[PDB]
């Protein structure tokens with residue numbers, strides 16, 4: 134029947150959900166399983182060994198948008214081509230590569246008598262070495278919740294890279310700060326939207342900005358993923374359904390003007406469940422994801438690609454044309 138291999142997971146909610154969908158757990162050494170779940174990223178050879186009926190929870194080449202240094206370099210090549218479309222990414226400087234370039238930006242800022250804050254990630258701040266770090270402009274005026282800075286963790290389901298299909302879960306995690314903000318309690322996004330409603334903010338625009346952010350982010354990753362997949366899977370017929378799917382964890386910060394900024398993409402987000410908020414959300418994320426796969430022999434998900442809007446789809450396909458063009462230039 135429909136079987137599963139949960140040897141590569143350490144989270145009970147993953148096993149719980151898979152057991153709840155009706156999957157029969159195979160012994161760990163069994164590679165025949167219809168579904169193969171692994172927490173961390175998989176070797177490309179493992180994806181190449183799959184059969185066309187099998188489904189694994191990771192795309193090959195997704196590290197181009199998950200690794201903060203790769204994400205910075207690729208987005209940079211994209212900003213230079215399409216700056217108006219990609220404004221959701223704070224300026225980032227990869228070290229020890231863009232050291233001199235970063236110093237020049239500080240030089241101009243000094244002469245202009247202006248000041249900016251900068252965050253250093255693997256974490257500390259700076260107001261202006263040969264180590265592998267990254268420098269990023271610091272969003273100084275974040276959206277505060279009762280005087281508190283918070284983080285958004287949204288969950289993205291990518292079911293295919295050919296044709297590209299992207300789903301956005303309309304719920305997630307909110308990580309409020311410990312001490313109040315000046316220039317960790319957990320909550321749900323569903324609750325945060327109800328907050329925005331009571332405080333009269335456009336919840337629809339919030340989701341729309343988030344959706345466009347994700348698609349345009351995956352658009353940057355698409356040429357990397359598509360090539361890796363096709364070289365990993367040379368035995369797939371022209372219209373063969375995707376062997377790979379993936380649940381990505383987007384870390385996102387909103388500024389005072391409720392503009393969503395991309396911080397990182399986690400291809401291996403913790404599905405741990407110590408609290409009830411973690412349970413309901415993450416179970417719903419995993420359960421509905423397997424539902425959409427429809428493994429044979431949506432719920433709180435909304436398809437953001439391909440969009441029902443024709444005009445928006447045209448813009449996306451234009452960006453994809455640029456993404457693939459930018460892709461060939463680098464390699």
Ligand SMILES: Nc1ncnc2c1ncn2[C@@H]1O[C@H](COP(=O)(O)OP(=O)(O)O)[C@@H](O)[C@H]1O
Nearest residue numbers: 223252254256269270271272273283284386396
């Ligand atoms: N460019 C940035 N601008 C403003 N605040 C940021 C920025 N980057 C991170 N913050 C904060 O830094 C924290 C993220 O820490 P990070 O090391 O990148 O990931 P992790 O959560 O695993 O520690 C978040 O609280 C986030 O709000």
